[PDB]
Automatic annotation (TrEMBL), chains C, D:
Transmembrane segments: none annotated. This is ORF25. The chain holds residues 395 to 443 of 1376 of the full protein.
Amino acid sequence: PTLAASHRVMLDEYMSNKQTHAPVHMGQYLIEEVAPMKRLLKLGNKVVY
Amino acid sequence: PTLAASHRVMLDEYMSNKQTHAPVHMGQYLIEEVAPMKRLLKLGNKVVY
Amino acid sequence: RIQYTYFFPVGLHLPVPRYSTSVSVRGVESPAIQSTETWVVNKNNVPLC
Amino acid sequence: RIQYTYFFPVGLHLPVPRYSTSVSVRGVESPAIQSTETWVVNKNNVPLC
Amino acid sequence: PTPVTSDVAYFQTPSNPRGRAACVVSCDAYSNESAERLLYDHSIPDPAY
């Protein structure tokens, strides 16, 4: 799977705190990716590896 | 891109906590600078690099 | 040149007792709103719908 | 001497399902508010509109 | 000047101030019509988006 945020907020919240984000909110979700390669996700200046 | 903040308030959030900052609020936004030079931003005595 | 596959959903509907975990997001908590797109981050870190 | 170009918005709208992520901002969040300027930080860290 | 509904998500990543990417280095060498078609024609979505 990949990053698939249903709304712009969930992807703006996975960046701010990797641990304490909600994988499933009331209406919307997010899929943290489980891939054999890892990447740096720079959305601005904040980095989530 | 450079620093932009559509209100004075959201430029305070970027310098209090850089990680848990929110890039887009309800009416307003912020753009963190992605530049080859990274300056020392110092407003007051709180410094965000 | 190793070639990996990826898969992500778009346009689902979560079941009736809608729960939550997060403490940050305030805008998208309505039961009437439904997401019709998903945001996938590019190779060069650019989110696309 | 090395010349850079600095890209910069002012005066936009945000679409209809307005959202937030910030934990601590008490004010601006009314929907009737409109931002008609953006703030820049100088070389000498003096914020200007 | 710029419509009020242009996305803010264009503004956090480095790009052109016009809405279309203009990197002509990628195009075939000594082909002026293929390079112009990248800049101007709208049958083709952006090389960025």
